[PDB]
Design an enzyme around this catalytic site. Sequence first.
Site, PDB file in Angstrom:
ATOM      1  CG  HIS A   1      -1.781  -1.458   1.483  1.00  0.00           C
ATOM      2  ND1 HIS A   1      -1.339  -2.081   2.054  1.00  0.00           N
ATOM      3  CD2 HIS A   1      -2.770  -1.753   0.744  1.00  0.00           C
ATOM      4  CE1 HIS A   1      -2.319  -3.278   1.933  1.00  0.00           C
ATOM      5  NE2 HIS A   1      -3.529  -2.933   1.376  1.00  0.00           N
TER       6      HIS A   1
ATOM      7  CG  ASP B   1      -1.023   0.425  -8.515  1.00  0.00           C
ATOM      8  OD1 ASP B   1      -1.080   1.334  -7.779  1.00  0.00           O
ATOM      9  OD2 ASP B   1      -2.080  -1.207  -8.752  1.00  0.00           O
TER      10      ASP B   1
ATOM     11  CG  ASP C   1      -3.291   4.081  -8.604  1.00  0.00           C
ATOM     12  OD1 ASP C   1      -3.342   3.169  -8.731  1.00  0.00           O
ATOM     13  OD2 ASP C   1      -3.483   3.989  -7.639  1.00  0.00           O
TER      14      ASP C   1
ATOM     15  CB  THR D   1     -14.554  -2.218  -7.500  1.00  0.00           C
ATOM     16  OG1 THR D   1     -13.494  -1.169  -7.030  1.00  0.00           O
ATOM     17  CG2 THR D   1     -14.001  -3.006  -5.221  1.00  0.00           C
TER      18      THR D   1
ATOM     19  CG  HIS E   1      -4.726  -0.248  -6.714  1.00  0.00           C
ATOM     20  ND1 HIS E   1      -3.346  -0.111  -6.384  1.00  0.00           N
ATOM     21  CD2 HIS E   1      -5.760   0.688  -5.522  1.00  0.00           C
ATOM     22  CE1 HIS E   1      -3.528   1.352  -6.240  1.00  0.00           C
ATOM     23  NE2 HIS E   1      -4.949   2.126  -5.498  1.00  0.00           N
ATOM     24  N   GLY E   2      -7.862  -0.526  -6.765  1.00  0.00           N
ATOM     25  CA  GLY E   2      -9.157  -0.372  -6.897  1.00  0.00           C
ATOM     26  C   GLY E   2      -8.761   1.245  -7.050  1.00  0.00           C
TER      27      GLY E   2
END
Length: 484
Positions: free
Chosen positions: A55, A195, A197, A252, A281-282
Amino acid sequence: KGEKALKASGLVPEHADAFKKIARELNTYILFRPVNKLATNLIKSGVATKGLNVHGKSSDWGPVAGYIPFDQDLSKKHGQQLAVEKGNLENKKSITEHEGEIGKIPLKLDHLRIEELKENGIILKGKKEIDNGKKYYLLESNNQVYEFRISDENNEVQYKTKEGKITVLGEKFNWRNIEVMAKNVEGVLKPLTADYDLFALAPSLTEIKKQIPQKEWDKVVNTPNSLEKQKGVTNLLIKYGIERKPDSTKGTLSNWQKQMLDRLNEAVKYTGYTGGDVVNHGTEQDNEEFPEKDNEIFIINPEGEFILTKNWEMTGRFIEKNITGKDYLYYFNRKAKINTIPTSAEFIKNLSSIRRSSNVGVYKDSGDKDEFAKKESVKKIAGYLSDYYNSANHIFSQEKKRKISIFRGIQAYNEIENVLKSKQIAPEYKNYFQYLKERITNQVQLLLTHQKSNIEFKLLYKQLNFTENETDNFEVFQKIIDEK
């Protein structure tokens, strides 16, 4: 907006042309998060990118900034008092929970990256100290509690703090490396990069008809009743769209939006990225451990004008100008809450945020029926707020969206009034429900004044009595909207 967003974000220009081709051939409002240029250099280097196992956010200084270092003090955890070990044990958990695609490899970066940071004006390649038996490439920084040591002949960083001063972590290490967490591409040495996003996604619903199966669309067009046709589309969306799957590596999304994502992942390989999936990731609100807030959003229109925003009120303004207030599919990231208060999943998050710290509340860990009745009340709250957060009420005009929005606000206010018809609850949830009902009255009130209703809220509340029916009491409420 076009060029100023493309320069202030530091976005990849060949990926900008690829995203213009994606938006032209797929007609989707691609929302995005602000990216760091220091991470973007290691993204366009081509190596693998992080997901949610680590994270580590984007740093403010470093050649390794953008990668996820072992010690998180070359990451977002810069100068943290008690959170440097939070990030440290968080990447320990990244190593020791997500086995299979988490590695222990040395670094993969550029040797001219220190000149990329001196042209950024950050580090200072100055005096040299002797370690590893050689006159090594010791380079200083500006913030001189830490300094990078990128190797002369190797592609690794044997970084250190100075041995004659204090460390902000409390330990002392002598020219240790970054044993960077990786992605095991069946043995290929590739570390993790911060990354690129997403923020949300928004196609048009007519295109969505050509993605979801549409012979039930050949069923749902042959109705003689308007609100029941909207409720059939409501059935279609509750069984199709929001029925999500929790992950941490894809995101998601809808399954058709997952096809959108894997099309986006494959369409950037021949453009300049060597890893494929750069969005791993989200979105902004999908980090439900703690949300954040940004000031600019790289929303990409279907036609090439990469829209940029200025203030959060301008985010809401341009969302209700473009995403919400048109015949598109506003699928967002689920006392100045002028338009958008958070979602009901975050309401359950706040429900658990003061039911564990204070064990008292609305209903306890019990077996009595009244406790499950207050559970049924908050169940109706959690249902009605997601009914309110359903902007797909636009098979008709958008004043139908406004009318259904104020209707769901009325029903949720009725539920919050019902939950104060209960036992002697803890006063924390009492003032919490006062907060909820006062913000929802303000929301439905200015939602009415942006309509042409001119009625106060209390009149419109006290006129309706929905005993058994959202079918003709909507006609009771709906009739006033139909006339003046």
